[model samples]
Target: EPALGYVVKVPVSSFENKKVDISDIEVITNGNLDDVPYKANSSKYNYPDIKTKDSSLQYVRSGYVIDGEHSGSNEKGYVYYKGNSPAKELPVNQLLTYTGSWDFTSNANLNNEEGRPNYLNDDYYTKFIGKRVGLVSGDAKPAKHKYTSQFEVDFATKKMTGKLSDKEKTIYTVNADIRGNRFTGAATASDKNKGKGESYNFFSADSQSLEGGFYGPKAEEMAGKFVANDKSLFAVFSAKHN
Candidate 1:
């Protein structure tokens, strides 16, 4: 159902209902993994895990569009833009052709949360405002232990919470207000309870499970279907036109 290792070419002249030129790009082979370590920057997670070396990876080249209004996320940063490619030859992992341009506004690194040190004050918990990041699991308890850092989550719902590590553990813990979206967040880390893992869970069913049909087009008749034809050639052509 998915194509792997297919080379795609999207026109750089313009994007999203118009033609535009993208100039600023950082194709670093091994760039800084979000600047600080987990203790300082929880959002600075490794691609695989906290301790995995592969997770601390930097790519040689990636396409990026930052602060563009067309991007659904609103904030400027990596758009996950993929060049035009025929349908049959789509890459299995979206990361294969990852595109993202760094923006000081949307970079999330600009916030001085992770770099500052924690001070010992009753009202002070240090900035501890590392990049807002989290993972959904079957339960909060397991996910909490799995990650060395706190999994800022909602106490009432027992659902995943958000905020810088220290804030979730300290500030939101008392009030039970776990809305981390206000502070720029990333994604679910691991699902120890549901016991599954994937790029992005569609229906939010199993933390690790990839619910393909839940979000995108399930079939040709339904929405989100890119290629009606199973053959690769037609899919590629359609993608090219798109």
Candidate 2:
């Protein structure tokens, strides 16, 4: 509700879970009813003359209004009006860019190191260059081994899942919660039989468009930095749409 000199019109059909500013809406009052006649399918509507004790406009559900004066012994007259207000805006139908299957890779030490050191530090990055850590690939294998991962995003449910393996051997698995364009979840390091072992963590990530480092438009590809709970340094990665 808004304090008004005007009434707001919102299209129920175009409501996309977004907020609207009352000041940005069309206003109709008793003085202008004739000037702004209600028209079916029009984008604007007249504000009802009804008011509460606080002087705010009263609203009803989409259809039908009540009539009468039987409230706590208060003597008042009421009436009903047919038809509902049409919300502004057109119908919206589309999926977010991050929806679908993705093939990705992570930096080494997503397992052993809480944080990764500089890339030039051969002593550090050299051993883990292409290594896929247990957090990303499920493998606790020695450094320098790269692993490919399968990640899937389900927009309807806001969930993400990842699987890491080599041939028939399962190395890691992950399940995470997604909100807006970001995701955070946990990973399970597993053995060849896919038996789960240690728990690994993941932090939030921006979509490809926002961060641009990883994550591509329309699920084409993505790459970015990531943080693990135990470490402070960020890990880099790149991924492609499957």
lDDT of 2 by residue, 20-120 (tens): 11112232333221222243323211223231121111221111111111122111111111111221221123222322111222322323243332232
- Candidate 1 weakest lDDT stretch, 10 residues: 233-242
Q: Which candidate leads in TM-score?
A: 2
Candidate 1, residues 9-72, lDDT tens digits: the string is 1112112322222222222222233321222322332221222222311211112222111222
TM-score of each: 0.16, 0.30
Candidate 1's TM-score reads: 0.16
Error of 2 at 71 (Å): 87
